[PDB]
Design an enzyme around this catalytic site. Structure first.
Site: not given
Lengths: 240, 245, 231, 240, 228, 187, 196, 203, 220
Positions: I1, I17, I19, I33, I47, I129, I166, I169
């Site tokens: 994320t 994001d 996902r 989120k 997390g 991440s 990434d 994400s």
């Protein structure tokens, strides 16, 4: 009428009669006095010799808290000992938390809160002692008196017990005649004189005089009893 | 220390709980408050009395938002009502919203408040609450509702009612003016007329408190973006009350 | 009297009547005498029995090798206080390798008694105690009342008709003060003192108990034939 | 606090519990409730105590899908006990994967009531319950429970302001082979005859039936709406 | 009886609360609080040669911004002062910003209401006046009583001779709210008290507490004389 | 540990190994009569099995005395499953697997339940615990019929026991039916 | 982390870097490691960020209660309050703290509470991962009764060397000066201290 | 891994004005088939829940949710809707944040007032996954994802939705050793619910 | 994320994001989120998703009760303190990494909170991440004074960098803008740069292809 049979019950006029009865119990005790000098405090007390079989110089009344607080009380002696034990616990907790001897006003507030907490419920009895205490801290010398209601004040000179009226008159004259202040030894002599004068109300029994002091220039800010030649000099001055 | 583990409210030989009756008397000595249910809203009204002329009466509110769609008013002892409102808000959050993600319906919240008030008449060493509550709310599956809660924890649903000093006269007036077809404006007008009788002092926007459970208010919702996200409860300002007078 | 119901009620003059009733319970007990010199301390006790077929009630309890006491009043209260004192002496020995001072034990008894006169649900104790001991300061005698008051004296007596023994001790103070190194003489002085409180009975081997502690003497109790030479 | 204790759980010199009797006297001044059990169903009928305000949305409650209760007394205490009973029924279903028999739930509620009478220092619940239920053991069951903790099983029972008159009326005109409609008529007739009011209108009544069928499975509980109550009153002959 | 604990009388009253109200007037001292649109001023009427005067005071500093004045016996006053200080510190720790005056007053009033409803607790026979300059509301005076009742004030007075001061304040406000002037507000309050009661208050007859935007402090006797 | 059960048209047959595990010479019975028409057999860690079985039996007998009524086998199985599910979350879970056989008098039909130490309850025409299933299921799958009589079920059980004895002594066989619980002596 | 505190003629000065790392990644270029606990009592924090922040919050709360009850606490009292939390919870926390205070009588004072929960009063203190590289230089350059400018220069040089050699320290140099005149904040950027 | 001990899979898809939820029937210990009649789908009124994972946890959660839904109906005097039941499931799961149930619950229903089909999935600690197309859970979750991302269409009649979900379930279960001993499908409309048992290779 | 927060001249904007994955398998292709603590206080969490949601909900409920009690609008520092103490009480066992932004009567505020209870204050922050790519963009393009439009563009660019580079994400971008004197503006799917292309064919099966053993009607 029925408002005097339980603690923490307001009377129609806004009174708590159990606390007043505790004051009556205080008024039946011996005379305890405290004097504030230029750099310290002096505590004096009278001990009645009920029987000649009592061991002289034993049965100590004045008590010490930490290494700088002196306490004396009039009323029911076991209640005074209970209060002094509580004060010692409070001083120990303060010293452990903040790494400094507890200031005298803070100690007075802790004692006052503890005494006040015993007027809040009908499952406990108010303390039947009036306490004169004090000492020396970084701010100087402090002298306080605490009553069974939990109210306390700082004094130039305090007296409690059966001979409180004459002691208060003598203290007022002493304060009026010395506007600058008094030294520690002069305060010890005056305390001896005032205790001897206040004993004249009760001539039925003999008495022993006990004196303690806490001064910056005489005890280096610690509380110490008066036992040596100074005690004899004070007794001679009082009897003169 | 606390040895009061026994009930202070007990049955008299005649079968009457004296403390609850005395609490009801204390309620009946309180100022008037009213509730009127309309077809598209509910009105709750009360008189605002000042203890002192130097007191800022705006700092004290007798009508309180319980949930965005539920409000309440009282007659009786003020501090008891304040504590009860705090407890009611907390129970609304901890009993319903943290379990289902939604605010509770009016009836269930009223039932929780009634449980709290009942517990004060049987637990040990406790005085019963000396208040009576009028609770107005709206929920999706039941519409608009008005309830009255007594010091004993008994609650009843009302089309219109009043509590306080002028309870009987206001109840008669409201009975004579009920037709099952009123709208919110008509209910507000009727509430103002009924309050004008029971107020002895000045009757303006600074001595009356009015609240309404009406339609959703997107203006009183400080964000935009979620189509499904409204606070139906609304408190009328003194200026609006003066305009309606 | 509406002020005597419990221990948390003051009278209008400031009196605790339950404490006074406990003191009255003390005043109806058998007489006991305590005495001391610069080297020894002695307790003398007159026992009592229910009837002839009954034994006599014990009155002297050992607290530690250097300390003991005699009771007057409600015996189970004396047992409670004696057990507390034994525990405190044992704690001092175990933790500090130290013999508990007599004055500190008196302070402990005062503190334990005070808590029973200020809170609801508890009565004051109904017994008076005479405590003798020998420590690093010499010989000590203490008198304990259930109000919490503890006093240190050369000699005293408690119980019924103890005034005569107290007067005798007050008159002959300078004599028994200086009986050093002669325990038998001090014991005989105590027996003579307790003889002043007798009216219609004489001391026998069945109703007389003696205890002694001293500089080289552990706390020891004599009863029966062991007191026959002191009568 | 010993003075203020009323000692709610002590006997009288005659072996009676004063609080239980006083709670019964309190119940004797509440709205009448009646339960009648026929060969194929149960009828519960309660009389409200009224104004011209909201009625469709206080005396009839549902415990589970097969057990209902009629309340006489304090409403909030009754709600407490009803919530406890609902939780108990759900616990029994969770443990045994079967519906709880009526008697077990009734006995549990009675034990809860008795506990307040024996131990503790709290007042008893001033509530009487009429239970109507169905189970596979005995079929249709009717019970009553009072603040004393005693529960009893009845063919026909009444609780409330006019229990004597209602019971005298029900002793006659009751048969062991009656039907649900006959039971409804008998309950309405008894309520009309015992009512201390000008007329028995639909706005002062609560009605419920437990039977078989009616767009359901084995057992159906029907709580009558005010319109249904009005229709039933017209059909029976009250026409009020 | 119903007159010994906090239970209802047959008339719906609570006699212990009324008696605590009576107890609030054990000390014959009056206090006055006013606002100056940038500060808040409280003045008290402290009245034996043996006492230390500097230790006698009924004005407490609850926190950096909040000050308190108590009418009633000093033991209950110090009980309430300690409780309020603890509550303010806990609020600041838990929520990260300074406790406001009105919220503290509400919390203390809730505690008083608890006392009025629980049998084993007796009410405190004191009246508490909290003053501050809130960062969201400006100068603020709030007052709580033994019944659990609290309200905010434009100005207020407490004591046995409070009717005269209240009438004088109301007349001043009718003439014309707040005071449009901290020293000037202090002198105004001193003059108001002098006119209401009489005589000439010396530096030892009063004590002054002043709450400004970021502080609450107490004036010494020398400062009070400087006002005079 | 051999614990096996077969439910036939009018009854339930349970078989439990009469062996222990040392050095001793006895004929252990691993079954407890929960009620006149409900029997339970157990296997697993020693000590836990007997304690759990006695606890269940005591609770069921207490319920029967209290209500003057016999719980159905389904209710008994649900209660046992609840107990095992509670146990698996406790500080010291029971490592016990059980078979419950019963004859429901209301429905007039035999019922067989299998529960493991985790709390997984399954109603089956035939079941087993341990390694009995791995060596018995081929025969049970090939030969079982829901309409078998008592004699046919006993014969199938005998074949299963012989198969178990091939890859190893003796079993105790219990029958639960409308007349209650009995033990087979000719087996 | 490279934190230090130096007593000088007119008071005390705290100094720190501003880098927080989660291994090799710099999670915050600009961190404030100088936390006020009382009007003229501050602390430099090193170790676990969560532990030090929680400890500082609790100490600030306790000192506010002390001020309301008893008056202005001393620097030694604040160090003792820190020490109680560090010592009693040493099995669950990782915190190295430097407490620096000023008062009229004692002027400036510095106390160090390293891991374990012991307190040491010093004329100056240094802590953090980057402290090891400047143990010599500071010992060779510290004097007593230095002026404000000299103390600023000393702290700047020491922290610049610590930043240069330690990979876990960097960013800007923050300093707080406690004197009778009050509290002053100072900041120095890499283009300033990297030329030293 | 407790979640992969007993096996089993559950799928859910949305239709035009309809919803569908399907499950496998296998119950095995480790690799031995114990029961082929273990249904993972339950309903509380018009809301359907399918649970994969430990069989004991499945039964326990079913009983607990039946308890809670009965009490909700008694207090509210109305059946619970899928959207509120989803929040209830999430809160019940998060109440065991550290001793969690090893379950894979999936909620499918139709809102009575709105008529819109609703579908959601949960992890073991109650994280909600709302999807407009489909939700999968079980030991064959990756196979189910592969089948659903290819076979699903945004709007299907219930007759076509049945074929789509059935083929996805069967073809994902035939590639999972721990899943598949029978299969059940539920097709749910506003006023009718149909249950169908599929024919399968067994082994 | 990937989650970012950026301040500008008169407010603060957060972005994230959409996902959520369980290992290498995408569990939710469109997940929210951005959590609402209060109408003008919004938090974005990375997390453990369940931990983030539950903790935000609990703190929001407590904040609402506190606001009712105090008769004042919630402050960002209050939410920061409550979240920080709740996370520190659990010693990192609650896996929530938060960016909390808001507007209150004291101004606009932006903070970051870690799972162990540490907090940071910054003008621009990133977490998750994909936080490295987003922080690269932010360090490349952030300026001291930014308008609302520029801040929205910068936050969206950082989220896009996290999406592109990434693996954990991707999908869409969600934005929330809070300005001092305005209502909060929540933009769901502000950008949707990952739309699946049409398939090569349709796999709708003819009716009757699936074998059926039995059928029944279920009474709901």
């Amino acid at each position: 009428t029925g408002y005097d049979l339980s603690n923490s019950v307001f009377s129609p006029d806004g009174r708590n009669f159990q606390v007043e009865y505790a004051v009556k119990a205080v008024e039946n005790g011996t005379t305890s006095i405290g004097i504030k000098c230029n750099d310290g405090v002096v505590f004096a007390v009278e001990k009645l010799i009920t029987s000649k079989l009592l061991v002289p110089q034993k049965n100590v009344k004045i008590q010490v808290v930490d290494r700088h607080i002196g306490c004396v009380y009039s009323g029911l002696i076991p209640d005074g000992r209970h209060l002094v034990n509580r004060g010692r616990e409070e001083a120990a907790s303060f010293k452990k938390l903040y790494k400094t001897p507890i200031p005298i006003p803070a100690f007075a507030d802790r004692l006052g809160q503890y005494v006040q907490a015993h007027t809040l419920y009908n499952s406990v009895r108010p303390f039947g002692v009036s306490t004169i205490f004090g000492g020396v801290d970084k701010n100087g010398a402090h002298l306080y008196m605490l009553e069974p209601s939990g109210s306390y004040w700082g004094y130039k000179g305090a007296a409690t017990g059966k001979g409180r009226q004459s002691a208060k008159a003598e203290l007022e004259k002493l304060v009026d005649h010395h506007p600058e202040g008094l030294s520690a030894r002069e305060a010890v002599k005056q305390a001896a004189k005032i205790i001897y004068l206040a004993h004249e109300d009760n001539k039925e029994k003999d008495f022993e005089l006990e004196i303690s002091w806490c001064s910056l220039s005489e005890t280096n800010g610690l509380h110490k009893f008066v036992k040596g030649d100074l005690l004899q000099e004070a007794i001679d001055f009082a009897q003169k | 220390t606390d040895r009061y583990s026994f009930s202070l409210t007990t049955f008299s030989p005649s079968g009457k709980l004296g403390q609850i009756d005395y609490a009801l008397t204390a309620v009946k000595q309180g100022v008037t408050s009213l509730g009127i249910k309309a077809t598209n809203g509910v009105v709750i009204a009360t008189e605002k009395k000042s203890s002192s002329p130097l007191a800022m009466s705006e700092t004290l509110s007798k009508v309180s938002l319980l949930t965005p769609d539920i409000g309440a008013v009282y007659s009786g002892m003020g501090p008891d009502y304040r504590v009860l409102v705090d407890k009611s808000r907390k129970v609304a959050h901890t009993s319903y919203k943290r379990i289902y993600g939604e605010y509770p319906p009016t009836k269930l919240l009223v039932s929780e408040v009634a449980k709290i008030m009942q517990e004060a008449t049987q637990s040990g060493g406790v005085r019963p609450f000396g208040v009576s509550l009028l609770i107005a709310g709206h929920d999706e599956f039941n519409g608009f509702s008005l309830y009255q809660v007594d010091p004993s924890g008994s609650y009843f649903p009302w089309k219109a009612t009043a509590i306080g000093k002028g309870s009987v006269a206001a109840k008669t007036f409201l009975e004579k003016r009920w037709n099952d077809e009123l709208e919110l404006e008509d209910a507000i007008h009727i509430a103002l007329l009924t309050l004008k009788e029971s107020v002895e002092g000045e009757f303006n926007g600074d001595t009356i408190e009015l609240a309404i459970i009406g339609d959703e208010n997107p203006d009183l919702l400080g964000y935009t973006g979620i189509p499904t996200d409204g606070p139906r409860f609304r408190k009328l300002t003194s200026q609006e009350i003066n305009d309606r007078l | 009297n509406n002020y005597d119901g419990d221990t948390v009620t003051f009278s209008p003059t400031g009196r605790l009547f339950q404490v006074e009733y406990a003191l009255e319970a003390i005043k109806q007990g058998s007489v006991t005498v305590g005495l001391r010199s610069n080297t020894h301390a002695v307790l003398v006790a007159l026992k009592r029995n229910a009837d002839e077929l009954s034994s006599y009630q014990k009155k002297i309890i050992k607290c530690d090798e250097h300390m003991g006491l005699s009771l007057a009043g409600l015996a189970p209260d004396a047992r409670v206080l004696s057990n507390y004192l034994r525990q405190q002496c044992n704690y001092s020995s175990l933790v500090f390798n130290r013999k508990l001072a007599v004055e500190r034990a008196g302070h402990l008894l005062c503190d334990k008694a005070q808590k029973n006169t200020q809170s609801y649900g508890g009565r004051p104790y109904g017994v008076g105690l005479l405590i003798i001991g020998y420590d690093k300061s010499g010989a000590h005698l203490l008198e304990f009342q259930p109000s919490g008051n503890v006093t240190e004296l050369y000699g005293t007596a408690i119980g019924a008709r103890s005034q005569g023994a107290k007067t005798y001790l007050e008159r002959t103070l300078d004599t028994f003060i200086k009986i050093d190194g002669n325990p038998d003489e001090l014991i005989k002085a105590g027996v003579e003192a307790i003889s002043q409180s007798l009216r219609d009975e004489s001391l026998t081997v069945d109703n007389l108990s003696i205890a002694i502690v001293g500089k080289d003497t552990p706390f020891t109790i004599y009863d029966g034939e062991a007191v026959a030479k002191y009568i | 606090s010993r003075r203020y204790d009323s000692r709610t759980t002590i006997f009288s010199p005659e072996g009676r519990l004063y609080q239980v009797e006083y709670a019964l006297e309190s119940i004797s001044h509440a709205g009448t409730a009646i339960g009648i059990m026929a060969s194929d169903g149960i009828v519960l009928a309660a009389e409200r105590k009224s104004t011209l305000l909201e009625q469709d949305t206080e005396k009839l409650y549902k415990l589970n899908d097969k057990i209902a209760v009629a309340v006489a007394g304090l409403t909030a205490d009754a709600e407490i006990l009803i919530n406890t009973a609902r939780i108990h029924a759900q616990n029994y279903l969770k443990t045994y994967n079967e519906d709880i028999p009526v008697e077990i739930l009734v006995r549990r509620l009675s034990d809860i009531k008795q506990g307040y009478t024996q131990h503790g220092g709290l007042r008893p619940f001033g509530v009487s319950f009429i239970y109507a239920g169905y189970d596979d053991r005995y079929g249709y069951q009717l019970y009553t429970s009072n603040p004393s903790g005693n529960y009893t099983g009845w063919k026909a029972i009444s609780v409330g302001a006019n229990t004597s008159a209602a019971q005298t009326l029900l002793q006659m005109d009751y048969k062991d082979d009656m039907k649900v409609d006959d039971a409804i008529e008998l309950a309405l007739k008894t309520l009309s005859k015992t009512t201390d009011s000008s007329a028995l209108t639909y706005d002062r009544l609560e009605f419920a039936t437990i039977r078989k069928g009616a767009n359901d499975g084995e057992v159906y509980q029907k709580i009558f709406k005010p319109q249904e109550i009005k229709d039933i009153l017209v059909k029976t002959g009250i026409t009020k | 009886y119903d007159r010994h604990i906090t239970i209802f009388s047959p008339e719906g009253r609570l006699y212990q609360v009324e008696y605590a109200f009576k107890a609030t007037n054990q000390t014959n001292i009056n206090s006055l609080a006013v606002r100056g649109k940038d500060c808040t001023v409280v003045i008290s009427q402290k009245k034996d040669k043996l006492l230390d005067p500097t230790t006698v005071s009924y004005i407490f500093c609850i926190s950096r911004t909040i000050g308190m004045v108590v009418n009633g016996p000093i033991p209950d006053a110090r009980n309430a002062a300690l409780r309020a200080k603890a509550e303010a510190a806990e609020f600041r720790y838990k929520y990260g910003y300074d406790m406001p005056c009105d919220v503290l007053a509400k919390r203390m009033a809730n505690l008083s209401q608890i006392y009025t409803q629980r049998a084993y607790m007796r009410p405190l026979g004191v009246i508490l006046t909290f003053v501050s300059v809130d960062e969201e509301l400006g100068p603020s005076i709030y007052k709580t009583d033994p019944a659990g009742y609290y309200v905010g004030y434009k100005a207020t007075a407490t004591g046995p001779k409070q009717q005269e001061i209240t009438t004088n304040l109301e007349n001043h406000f009718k003439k014309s709210d707040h005071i449009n002037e901290w020293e000037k507000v202090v002198e105004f309050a001193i003059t108001h008290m002098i006119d209401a009661l009489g005589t000439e208050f010396s530096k030892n007859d009063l004590e002054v507490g002043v709450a400004t935007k970021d502080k609450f402090f107490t004036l010494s006797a020398e400062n009070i004389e400087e006002r005079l | 540990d051999i614990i096996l059960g077969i439910r036939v048209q009018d009854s339930v047959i349970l078989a439990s190994s009469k062996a222990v595990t040392g050095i001793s010479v006895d004929s252990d019975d691993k079954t407890r009569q929960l009620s006149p028409h409900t029997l339970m057999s157990f296997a697993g860690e020693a000590g836990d099995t007997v304690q759990f079985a006695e606890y269940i039996q005591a609770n069921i007998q207490l319920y029967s005395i209290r209500e003057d009524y016999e719980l159905s086998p389904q209710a008994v199985s649900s209660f046992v499953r609840q107990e095992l599910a509670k146990s698996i979350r406790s500080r010291r879970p029971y490592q016990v697997n059980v078979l419950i056989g019963g004859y429901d008098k209301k429905k007039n039909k035999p019922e067989l339940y299998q529960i493991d130490y985790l709390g997984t309850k399954v109603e089956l025409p035939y079941g087993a615990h341990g390694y009995s299933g791995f060596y018995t299921f081929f025969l049970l799958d090939h030969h079982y019929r829901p309409d078998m009589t008592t004699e046919e079920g006993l014969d199938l059980l005998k074949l299963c026991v012989q198969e178990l004895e091939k890859r190893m002594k003796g079993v105790i066989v219990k029958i639960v039916d409308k007349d209650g619980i009995r033990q087979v002596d000719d087996f | 982390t490279s934190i230090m505190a130096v007593t000088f003629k007119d008071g005390v000065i705290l100094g720190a870097d501003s880098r927080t790392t989660t291994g090799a990644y710099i999670a915050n270029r600009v961190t404030d490691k100088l936390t006020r606990v009382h009007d003229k009592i501050w602390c430099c924090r090193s170790g676990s960020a969560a532990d030090t922040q929680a400890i500082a919050d609790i100490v600030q709360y306790h000192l506010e209660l002390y001020t309301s009850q008893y008056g202005t606490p001393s620097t030694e009292t604040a160090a003792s309050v820190f020490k109680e939390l560090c010592y009693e919870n040493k099995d669950n926390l990782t915190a190295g703290i430097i407490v620096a205070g000023y008062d009229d009588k004692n002027k400036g004072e510095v106390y160090t509470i390293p891991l374990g929960g012991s307190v040491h009063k010093l004329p100056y203190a240094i802590a953090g991962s980057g402290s090891t590289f400047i143990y010599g230089y500071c010992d060779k350059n510290f004097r007593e009764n230095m002026s404000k400018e000299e103390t600023v220069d000393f702290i700047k040089h020491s922290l610049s060397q610590a930043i240069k050699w330690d990979g876990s320290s960097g960013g800007v140099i923050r300093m707080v000066v406690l004197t009778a005149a009050g509290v002053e904040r100072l900041i120095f950027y890499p283009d300033e201290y990297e030329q030293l | 891994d407790p979640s992969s001990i007993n096996g089993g899979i559950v799928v859910a898809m949305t239709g035009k004005d309809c919803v569908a939820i399907a499950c496998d029937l296998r119950l095995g210990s480790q690799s031995l088939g114990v029961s082929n009649k273990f249904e993972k789908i339950f309903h509380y009124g018009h809301v359907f829940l399918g649970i994969t994972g430990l069989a004991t946890d499945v039964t326990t959660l079913n009983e607990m949710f039946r308890y809670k839904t009965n009490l909700y109906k008694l207090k509210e005097e109305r059946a619970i809707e899928p959207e509120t039941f989803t929040q209830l499931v999430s809160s019940s799961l998060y109440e065991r944040r550290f001793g969690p149930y090893f379950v894979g619950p999936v909620v499918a229903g139709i809102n009575s007032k709105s008529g819109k089909p609703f579908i959601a999935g949960f992890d073991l600690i109650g994280c909600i996954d709302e999807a407009k197309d489909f939700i999968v859970s079980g030991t064959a979750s990756d196979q189910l994802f592969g089948m659903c991302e290819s076979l699903y269409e945004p709007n299907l009649e219930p007759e076509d939705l049945f074929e789509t979900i059935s083929q996805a379930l069967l073809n994902a279960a035939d590639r999972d050793a721990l899943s598949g001993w029978g299969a059940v499908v539920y097709i749910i409309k506003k006023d009718e619910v149909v249950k169908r048992y599929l024919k399968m290779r067994q082994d | 994320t990937t989650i970012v927060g950026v301040k500008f001249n008169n407010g603060v904007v957060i972005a994230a994001d959409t996902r959520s994955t369980q290992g290498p398998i995408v569990a939710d292709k469109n997940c929210a989120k951005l959590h609402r603590i209060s109408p003008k206080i919004w938090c974005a969490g990375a997390g453990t998703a369940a931990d983030t949601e539950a903790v935000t909900q609990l703190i929001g409920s407590n904040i609402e009760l506190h606001s009712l009690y105090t008769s004042r609008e919630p402050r960002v520092v209050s939410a920061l303190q409550m979240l920080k103490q709740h996370l520190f009480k659990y010693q990192g066992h609650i896996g929530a990494y938060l960016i909390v932004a808001g507007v209150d009567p004291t101004g606009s505020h932006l903070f970051s909170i870690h799972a162990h209870g540490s907090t940071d204050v910054g003008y621009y922050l990133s977490l998750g991440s994909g936080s490295l790519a987003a922080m690269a963009v932010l360090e490349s393009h952030w300026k001291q004074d930014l308008t609302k439009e520029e801040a929205i563009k910068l936050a969206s660019d950082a989220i896009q960098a996290g999406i592109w580079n990434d693996l954990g994400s991707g999908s869409n971008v969600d934005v929330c803008v809070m300005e001092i004197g305005k209502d909060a503006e929540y933009l769901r799917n502000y950008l949707t740069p990952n739309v699946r292309e049409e398939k090569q064919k349709s796999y709708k099966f003819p009716r009757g292809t699936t074998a059926v053993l039995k059928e029944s009607i279920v009474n709901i």
